[PDB]
Amino acid sequence: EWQENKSWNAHFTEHKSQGVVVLWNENKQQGFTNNLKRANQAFLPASTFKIPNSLIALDLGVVKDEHQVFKWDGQTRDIAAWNRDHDLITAMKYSVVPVYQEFARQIGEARMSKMLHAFDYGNEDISGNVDSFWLDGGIRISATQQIAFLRKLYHNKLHVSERSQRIVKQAMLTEANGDYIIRAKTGYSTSIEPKIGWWVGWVELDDNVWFFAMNMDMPTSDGLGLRQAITKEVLKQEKIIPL
Amino acid sequence: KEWQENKSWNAHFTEHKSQGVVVLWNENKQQGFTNNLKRANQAFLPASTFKIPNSLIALDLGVVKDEHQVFKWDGQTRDIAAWNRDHDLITAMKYSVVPVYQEFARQIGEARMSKMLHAFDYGNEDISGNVDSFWLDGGIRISATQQIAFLRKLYHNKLHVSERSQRIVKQAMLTEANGDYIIRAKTGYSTSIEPKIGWWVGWVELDDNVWFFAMNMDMPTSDGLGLRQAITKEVLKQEKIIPLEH
Ligand SMILES: [Cl-]
């Protein structure tokens, strides 16, 4: 069952923004959103694709473990954090596109397509370059479809090893304290209009888990911090996380 | 296994009207540091820090199916309100729920508990006393340097249990995380046998290094319990391992 909560629009309006927040209460099996139409609108996943890409790379043995070093290729790029060696944890933390591009080339088109079909991920279409389809290719996913996929990963129900699903949930670790744990992934789609920002994941509490998926219009990179800020405003309103 | 003494850390114990030891291990450099080499090697009851090897054993034996399995409250009201409810492995660890772990120990049994602690080379490997209380009032003893030795094996999945068991326990140990560091740790509070002490053992994961830690301090009254984390964080901040506020 899906419910609309238009009061969340105050959080978009106050941050001079436009977008959608989708929440799922695991215990109650009830979904909530400020906009049912935008919740079901499909977009490029951008770097949120690092979640299924990590799972495939791990199950195939392209990535041995979360410690394996993928050395810098020597090419200087715009993001200074990419111009160094990384493992799965830091490549995920710093959204290191060149590391994941290399994984995709090693996975190859045939295995990427067929394995992504097993996850029923979005439109299941990998059209375009094997190493850029999630940034400028044919793949599309909605915020409600991000929740559907994330719930399977939470329960180890994706058709991949339990081990790979545990490593990826560890690599997704964003924040933790004595009140809650956040496992999530950011995304930033710039190649095809509309330019959007993503934040997808979940909040683990003592007696419940709240799944979330958000996307917002992102005309300039100076609004990137609003992906987390707007989501945290909604979570605080719903008393999911403290003030 | 080279060890260096840093007596400047004593300022943190004295200023807090306290006494104890902090032991650090720099994984990349394979170098240890402590304010007191003698106390670093002094063995004590592990108290609730034993929830780390006990969880590993319970999962490996199938006593605990997964980190989601509910261990229902027995109905007996205890002093700690957080214990008087149902728990899974994550919350029993978070709230140090002794009655849940006592039940695990009874299900594991003496023979398997001893064999496992022997295969882990855990402290003095002595489980003398009640099978469900030996880590609180029995014969088991472990030092802060031995806590580091054991924690380093767990970090590298080198203990003699399944990789899965080791991953679940490292997840249950999750204490704090942000964009600067991750802390995986366990607190302990030994009160049954003198000297009453406080424990904080675990590690700090950084982007390009891991810092293992083990601390214990004298704990005559429970009002000093927060100093276990506060004194360790003061040492980590001094060594620039974690930021001041950033
Ligand atoms: Cl974790």
XYZ file of C-alpha atoms and ligand atoms in Angstrom:
490
model
C 0.000 0.000 0.000
C 1.229 3.496 -0.967
C 0.416 6.781 0.839
C 1.128 10.392 -0.105
C 2.471 12.915 2.466
C 2.493 16.373 0.801
C 3.781 18.061 4.024
C 7.301 16.824 2.993
C 7.154 19.369 0.098
C 7.973 22.059 2.766
C 11.511 20.493 2.952
C 12.013 20.785 -0.868
C 10.547 24.391 -0.939
C 12.703 25.603 2.007
C 15.883 24.263 0.286
C 14.849 26.009 -3.034
C 14.559 22.456 -4.518
C 12.294 20.080 -6.476
C 12.208 16.298 -6.069
C 10.842 13.149 -4.384
C 11.461 11.269 -1.082
C 10.183 7.659 -0.895
C 10.072 5.821 2.499
C 9.225 2.176 3.282
C 8.372 0.991 6.828
C 9.604 -2.680 6.884
C 7.556 -3.765 9.948
C 4.269 -2.247 8.650
C 4.941 -3.060 4.894
C 3.705 0.464 4.064
C 5.241 2.981 1.640
C 5.121 6.820 1.860
C 6.053 9.608 -0.562
C 5.487 13.343 -1.099
C 4.803 12.677 -4.833
C 3.413 9.303 -6.150
C 3.996 10.330 -9.821
C 7.719 11.292 -9.375
C 8.240 8.215 -7.028
C 7.462 6.032 -10.124
C 9.396 8.160 -12.704
C 12.448 6.285 -14.084
C 15.876 7.972 -14.428
C 19.525 6.999 -15.055
C 20.813 5.423 -11.790
C 24.231 7.134 -12.201
C 26.589 6.060 -9.294
C 23.704 4.287 -7.376
C 24.507 1.505 -9.985
C 27.730 0.861 -7.920
C 25.440 -1.279 -5.676
C 24.451 -3.967 -8.351
C 27.869 -3.529 -10.143
C 29.752 -4.392 -6.852
C 27.467 -7.487 -6.329
C 28.187 -8.823 -9.918
C 31.974 -8.064 -9.710
C 32.130 -9.981 -6.358
C 30.102 -13.043 -7.390
C 32.197 -13.388 -10.612
C 35.482 -13.021 -8.727
C 36.352 -9.792 -10.659
C 36.730 -8.353 -7.101
C 38.258 -10.910 -4.674
C 37.311 -9.076 -1.431
C 36.771 -5.553 0.001
C 40.622 -5.287 0.516
C 41.854 -5.933 -3.061
C 43.723 -2.820 -4.381
C 42.771 -1.423 -7.791
C 45.808 0.773 -8.595
C 45.459 4.251 -10.188
C 46.004 4.169 -13.969
C 48.177 7.335 -13.890
C 45.636 9.527 -15.731
C 44.836 12.745 -13.806
C 41.072 13.360 -13.493
C 38.965 16.327 -12.166
C 38.097 14.587 -8.845
C 41.391 14.522 -6.842
C 40.145 11.524 -4.735
C 40.033 9.380 -7.944
C 43.765 10.040 -8.686
C 44.963 7.360 -6.204
C 44.729 3.603 -5.524
C 41.484 2.254 -4.029
C 39.793 -0.879 -2.625
C 35.990 -1.599 -2.721
C 35.253 0.482 0.474
C 37.037 3.711 -0.706
C 36.000 3.328 -4.411
C 32.396 3.241 -3.101
C 33.023 6.064 -0.516
C 34.569 8.401 -3.193
C 32.325 7.134 -6.098
C 35.431 6.197 -8.159
C 33.905 5.819 -11.681
C 37.236 4.653 -13.371
C 37.521 1.691 -10.907
C 33.904 0.583 -11.661
C 34.361 1.200 -15.422
C 37.224 -1.373 -15.289
C 34.976 -3.870 -13.381
C 32.219 -3.505 -16.081
C 34.765 -4.182 -18.934
C 35.936 -7.335 -17.038
C 32.294 -8.458 -16.404
C 31.456 -7.889 -20.136
C 28.075 -7.156 -21.838
C 26.648 -10.738 -21.829
C 27.220 -11.381 -18.100
C 26.251 -7.794 -17.076
C 22.919 -8.006 -18.946
C 21.894 -11.545 -17.859
C 22.993 -11.051 -14.225
C 21.233 -7.671 -14.016
C 18.125 -9.420 -15.454
C 18.301 -11.816 -12.414
C 17.958 -8.750 -10.063
C 14.955 -7.386 -12.099
C 16.772 -4.023 -11.761
C 14.724 -1.135 -13.215
C 14.103 -1.454 -16.975
C 16.843 -4.266 -17.157
C 18.307 -2.494 -20.305
C 22.157 -2.070 -20.517
C 22.209 -0.385 -24.022
C 25.293 1.775 -24.711
C 28.983 1.372 -23.747
C 29.538 -1.527 -21.333
C 31.648 0.908 -19.156
C 29.245 3.948 -19.178
C 25.629 2.650 -19.716
C 24.639 3.701 -16.140
C 25.787 7.314 -16.843
C 24.802 7.877 -20.511
C 23.180 4.627 -21.765
C 19.694 3.083 -21.803
C 19.320 1.896 -18.147
C 16.436 3.501 -16.158
C 15.214 3.013 -12.546
C 12.530 4.741 -10.402
C 12.745 5.593 -6.669
C 10.081 2.881 -5.852
C 12.139 0.357 -7.903
C 15.293 1.371 -5.888
C 13.359 0.401 -2.662
C 12.215 -2.938 -4.218
C 15.875 -3.822 -5.092
C 17.304 -2.548 -1.728
C 14.762 -4.669 0.251
C 16.013 -7.835 -1.545
C 19.649 -6.886 -0.725
C 18.703 -6.240 2.950
C 17.147 -9.800 3.245
C 19.984 -11.500 1.198
C 17.230 -12.424 -1.346
C 19.098 -11.356 -4.542
C 20.280 -14.357 -6.676
C 23.902 -13.883 -5.597
C 25.926 -15.281 -2.671
C 25.133 -14.174 0.910
C 28.850 -13.189 1.220
C 28.667 -10.680 -1.717
C 25.432 -9.135 -0.332
C 27.187 -8.810 3.138
C 30.324 -7.135 1.576
C 28.216 -4.659 -0.414
C 26.073 -3.809 2.678
C 29.388 -3.186 4.538
C 30.709 -1.000 1.606
C 27.386 0.995 1.780
C 28.089 1.973 5.434
C 27.673 5.783 5.554
C 26.892 6.722 9.201
C 26.335 4.986 12.536
C 25.892 5.985 16.199
C 23.951 4.733 19.291
C 20.615 5.761 17.672
C 20.727 4.483 14.046
C 22.786 3.085 11.140
C 22.651 4.417 7.532
C 23.700 2.157 4.599
C 23.335 4.142 1.370
C 24.653 5.319 -1.994
C 24.659 8.749 -3.720
C 24.305 9.329 -7.480
C 24.672 12.321 -9.785
C 23.331 12.054 -13.385
C 24.710 14.845 -15.634
C 25.013 13.375 -19.166
C 21.316 13.277 -20.124
C 18.698 15.931 -19.166
C 17.210 16.313 -16.538
C 20.376 16.493 -14.386
C 19.434 14.810 -11.065
C 20.836 13.889 -7.661
C 20.142 10.496 -5.976
C 20.377 9.159 -2.344
C 19.176 5.562 -1.883
C 19.541 3.186 1.062
C 18.071 2.439 4.483
C 18.089 3.340 8.177
C 18.513 0.477 10.659
C 16.901 1.034 14.065
C 16.683 -1.369 17.031
C 13.215 -2.721 16.148
C 12.624 -1.565 12.511
C 14.288 -0.690 9.217
C 13.270 2.300 7.059
C 14.152 2.044 3.377
C 14.576 5.295 1.429
C 15.095 6.497 -2.143
C 15.306 10.142 -3.128
C 15.993 12.092 -6.323
C 15.971 15.841 -6.961
C 16.673 18.267 -9.824
C 20.420 19.152 -9.799
C 21.212 21.977 -12.303
C 24.576 22.837 -10.615
C 26.907 20.761 -8.363
C 26.632 23.276 -5.463
C 23.308 21.640 -4.409
C 24.812 18.107 -4.006
C 24.658 18.267 -0.170
C 20.836 18.744 -0.364
C 20.440 15.055 -1.304
C 21.291 14.109 2.324
C 19.954 17.328 3.972
C 16.391 17.075 2.492
C 16.192 13.278 3.302
C 17.365 13.926 6.934
C 14.667 16.658 7.320
C 11.967 14.072 6.289
C 13.441 11.360 8.638
C 13.510 13.869 11.565
C 9.861 14.880 10.859
C 8.822 11.205 10.974
C 10.843 10.720 14.255
C 12.975 8.037 12.484
C 16.242 9.757 13.522
C 16.717 12.286 16.412
C 17.055 16.104 16.046
C 55.957 -6.800 17.420
C 57.966 -3.719 18.554
C 56.412 -1.785 21.503
C 56.869 1.878 22.392
C 55.839 3.577 25.617
C 54.141 7.000 25.523
C 53.806 8.294 29.127
C 52.227 11.607 27.944
C 48.901 9.629 27.648
C 48.907 9.440 31.503
C 47.774 13.106 31.496
C 44.350 11.759 30.223
C 43.994 9.297 33.109
C 45.223 11.762 35.859
C 43.013 14.699 34.588
C 39.958 12.382 34.746
C 40.922 11.259 38.334
C 41.587 7.796 36.808
C 44.179 5.086 36.275
C 44.531 2.573 33.469
C 46.095 1.540 30.183
C 45.518 2.381 26.471
C 47.119 0.027 23.913
C 47.233 0.998 20.221
C 48.418 -1.017 17.200
C 49.235 0.616 13.824
C 48.388 -2.163 11.249
C 50.414 -0.660 8.351
C 53.597 -0.108 10.437
C 53.209 -3.293 12.607
C 53.975 -1.092 15.661
C 52.386 -1.029 19.101
C 52.095 1.918 21.534
C 51.036 2.118 25.187
C 51.238 4.483 28.196
C 52.142 1.485 30.430
C 53.902 -1.684 29.101
C 53.382 -3.544 32.448
C 49.558 -2.912 32.631
C 49.272 -3.594 28.812
C 50.335 -7.216 29.647
C 48.295 -7.584 32.904
C 45.478 -10.175 32.554
C 41.923 -9.495 33.841
C 38.402 -10.968 33.532
C 37.131 -10.010 30.035
C 33.588 -9.353 31.401
C 31.236 -8.376 28.454
C 34.176 -8.088 25.942
C 33.752 -11.960 25.934
C 30.533 -11.335 23.861
C 32.933 -11.122 20.847
C 34.278 -14.806 21.039
C 30.927 -16.045 22.507
C 29.005 -14.629 19.442
C 31.570 -16.250 17.044
C 31.151 -19.674 18.757
C 27.295 -19.442 18.936
C 27.052 -18.561 15.200
C 29.597 -21.225 14.150
C 27.766 -23.931 16.093
C 24.352 -22.783 14.736
C 23.189 -21.852 18.304
C 22.472 -18.432 16.671
C 21.063 -18.844 13.100
C 21.670 -15.201 11.997
C 21.874 -11.609 13.369
C 17.990 -11.420 13.039
C 16.961 -14.452 15.178
C 14.871 -13.268 18.182
C 15.822 -14.466 21.665
C 12.616 -13.729 23.627
C 12.722 -12.237 27.162
C 12.375 -14.909 29.875
C 9.885 -12.777 31.870
C 12.275 -12.155 34.796
C 12.665 -8.432 35.581
C 16.322 -7.373 35.906
C 18.028 -4.078 37.024
C 18.952 -3.025 33.438
C 15.605 -2.057 31.778
C 17.058 -2.712 28.269
C 17.514 -6.425 29.190
C 13.772 -6.819 30.029
C 12.732 -7.216 26.355
C 13.298 -9.478 23.317
C 16.592 -9.106 21.433
C 18.516 -10.255 18.350
C 22.377 -10.481 18.089
C 22.804 -6.736 17.181
C 20.774 -5.341 20.181
C 21.960 -8.031 22.680
C 25.505 -6.837 21.777
C 24.510 -3.104 21.795
C 22.852 -3.370 25.284
C 25.312 -6.046 26.635
C 22.407 -8.445 27.393
C 24.100 -10.972 29.773
C 20.984 -13.307 30.092
C 20.885 -13.814 26.280
C 24.611 -14.761 26.192
C 24.266 -16.938 29.335
C 21.671 -19.001 27.367
C 24.067 -19.269 24.357
C 26.894 -20.553 26.685
C 24.580 -23.269 28.197
C 23.681 -24.385 24.615
C 27.384 -24.334 23.528
C 28.358 -26.383 26.622
C 31.704 -26.704 28.464
C 33.501 -29.080 26.012
C 32.819 -27.000 22.862
C 33.400 -23.660 24.690
C 36.877 -24.827 25.883
C 37.932 -26.327 22.475
C 36.928 -23.075 20.637
C 38.734 -20.759 23.102
C 41.803 -23.030 22.687
C 41.603 -22.853 18.848
C 41.276 -18.982 19.205
C 44.287 -18.827 21.650
C 42.025 -16.534 23.754
C 43.840 -15.223 26.858
C 44.679 -18.032 29.338
C 42.122 -20.390 27.519
C 40.773 -21.339 31.014
C 36.922 -21.566 31.316
C 36.852 -22.680 35.036
C 33.593 -21.898 36.871
C 29.946 -21.929 35.730
C 29.594 -22.441 31.955
C 27.148 -19.423 31.955
C 29.227 -16.982 34.138
C 32.970 -17.908 33.786
C 33.690 -14.589 31.925
C 32.209 -12.583 34.851
C 33.283 -14.573 37.956
C 35.282 -17.606 36.723
C 38.900 -18.415 35.833
C 39.227 -16.772 32.351
C 41.849 -13.973 32.071
C 42.958 -11.776 29.126
C 45.393 -8.800 28.810
C 44.992 -5.668 26.654
C 47.849 -6.845 24.317
C 46.112 -10.272 24.042
C 42.807 -8.457 23.150
C 44.700 -6.777 20.185
C 46.218 -10.155 19.098
C 42.698 -11.753 19.026
C 41.019 -8.669 17.375
C 43.676 -8.625 14.573
C 42.787 -12.300 13.727
C 39.063 -11.393 13.633
C 39.791 -8.355 11.381
C 41.685 -10.611 8.844
C 39.108 -13.500 9.058
C 41.975 -15.668 10.457
C 40.047 -17.194 13.411
C 39.059 -20.855 13.167
C 35.345 -20.268 12.532
C 33.549 -19.540 9.213
C 34.248 -16.230 7.355
C 30.431 -15.610 7.609
C 30.594 -15.899 11.493
C 33.455 -13.388 11.556
C 31.609 -10.948 9.196
C 28.377 -11.099 11.305
C 30.303 -10.347 14.564
C 32.259 -7.433 12.945
C 28.839 -6.048 11.859
C 27.417 -6.550 15.471
C 30.518 -4.641 16.785
C 29.608 -1.527 14.727
C 29.661 1.394 17.232
C 30.236 4.611 15.217
C 30.853 5.664 11.608
C 31.089 8.927 9.617
C 33.073 10.313 6.619
C 36.326 10.267 8.662
C 36.441 6.860 10.437
C 34.604 3.673 11.513
C 34.729 2.203 15.087
C 33.985 -1.539 15.669
C 34.258 -2.244 19.393
C 32.960 -3.805 22.639
C 32.693 -2.465 26.247
C 33.110 -4.542 29.419
C 32.568 -3.905 33.145
C 34.054 -6.450 35.624
C 32.539 -6.077 39.138
C 32.443 -9.623 40.666
C 36.161 -10.016 41.447
C 38.548 -7.218 42.596
C 39.897 -5.020 40.997
C 36.660 -3.658 39.459
C 37.635 -2.535 35.919
C 36.194 -1.028 32.732
C 37.124 -2.311 29.219
C 36.870 -0.840 25.630
C 38.397 -3.050 22.901
C 38.140 -2.807 19.121
C 39.547 -0.893 16.150
C 39.321 2.281 14.044
C 39.096 1.843 10.261
C 40.541 4.706 8.211
C 40.809 4.937 4.406
C 44.424 3.660 4.240
C 45.043 2.137 7.727
C 43.424 0.367 10.678
C 44.240 1.218 14.333
C 43.530 -1.553 16.832
C 42.870 -0.556 20.448
C 42.389 -2.151 23.876
C 41.871 -0.210 27.056
C 41.124 -1.000 30.683
C 40.860 1.293 33.676
C 40.081 1.062 37.409
C 36.295 1.398 37.928
C 35.451 1.673 41.691
C 32.040 3.348 40.972
C 29.792 3.187 37.846
C 29.871 7.023 37.378
C 33.205 6.641 35.519
C 31.840 4.223 32.839
C 31.794 6.925 30.101
C 35.588 7.442 30.615
C 36.265 4.128 28.829
C 35.348 5.810 25.503
C 36.310 9.407 26.499
C 39.934 8.538 27.610
C 40.455 6.328 24.419
C 39.097 9.182 22.171
C 41.467 11.689 23.923
C 44.455 9.396 23.041
C 43.216 8.893 19.391
C 42.770 12.699 18.990
C 46.297 13.335 20.407
C 47.744 10.851 17.855
C 45.687 12.549 15.027
C 43.928 9.180 14.315
C 40.449 10.781 14.573
C 39.556 14.524 14.229
C 38.790 16.954 17.087
C 35.369 17.906 15.540
C 35.808 17.584 11.683
Cl 29.030 -2.918 8.887
